[PDB]
Design a protein around this ligand. Structure first.
Ligand SMILES: O=C(O)CNC(=O)c1nc(Cl)c2ccccc2c1O
Ligand SMILES: [Fe+2]
Length: 224
């Protein structure tokens, strides 16, 4: 699918109606596989953090750690297919510009690459952007060949505002997900029993981010 077609015929109407959108087979398998090798390579060469402290036991031999991360700009040695994905995410968003809510997306973060190490850790119920920091859309790409959740866990459970029900999304190979970052979409990752990779970028709305600047707040100091 051409990027603009996916945008106009799927991502735009779906986001505006449901605020959660799944595109399967986004880059195809040669390119997915390649991103996979790049992410595994970052892992094996120790580029990730050790993982979120889950259980801080008193003896610390026995501390339990969870999701590991690394931030990627997209041009680093070893990361060029990741840079490629990011560029591809950007192209898709830019083809939706204007058309997702009344937002005007002018910015994103670096890619946050996450590895749930498969030791039964997950990620607690949260909202990505609760306090108005400018992030309007979360975009995650999943890396996980032949993932079977019945076996390996690691479902993303989203809990849309004012719904009795949730939405389970499997972290399937070459799947791209978008959802609104704010309190509309509380979500969690259920415990993962196999190594589970995902790559997230967040997109900024211009107005929200411009006044987050003010609210939050050397520099951005000047003078006297
Ligand atoms: O990976 C997934 O399917 C969903 N993950 C997340 O919702 C998620 N969200 C945040 Cl805000 C963080 C934040 C830091 C590290 C990992 C995160 C994470 O996996
Ligand atoms: Fe999240």
């Amino acid at each position: 699918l051409p990027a603009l077609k996916l945008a106009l015929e799927y991502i735009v109407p779906c986001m505006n109606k449901h605020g959660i959108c799944v595109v399967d087979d986004f880059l195809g398998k040669e390119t997915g596989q390649q991103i996979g090798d790049e992410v595994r390579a970052l892992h094996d060469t120790g580029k990730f953090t050790d993982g979120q402290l889950v259980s801080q036991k008193s003896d610390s031999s026995k501390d339990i750690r969870g999701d590991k991360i690394t931030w990627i700009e997209g041009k680093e040695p070893g990361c060029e297919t990741i840079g490629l994905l990011m560029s591809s995410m950007d192209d898709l968003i830019r083809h939706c510009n204007g058309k997702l809510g009344s937002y005007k997306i002018n910015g994103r973060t670096k890619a946050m690459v996450a590895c749930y190490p498969g030791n039964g850790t997950g990620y607690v119920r949260h909202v990505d952007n609760p306090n108005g920091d400018g992030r309007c859309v979360t975009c995650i790409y999943y890396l996980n060949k032949d993932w079977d959740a019945k076996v390996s866990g690691g479902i993303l459970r989203i809990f849309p505002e004012g719904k009795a029900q949730f939405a389970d999304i499997e972290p399937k190979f070459d799947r791209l997900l978008f959802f609104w970052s704010d309190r509309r979409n509380p979500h969690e990752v259920q415990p993962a029993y196999a190594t589970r990779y995902a790559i997230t970028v967040w997109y900024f709305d211009a107005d929200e981010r411009a006044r987050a600047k003010v609210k939050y707040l050397k520099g951005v100091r000047v003078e006297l």
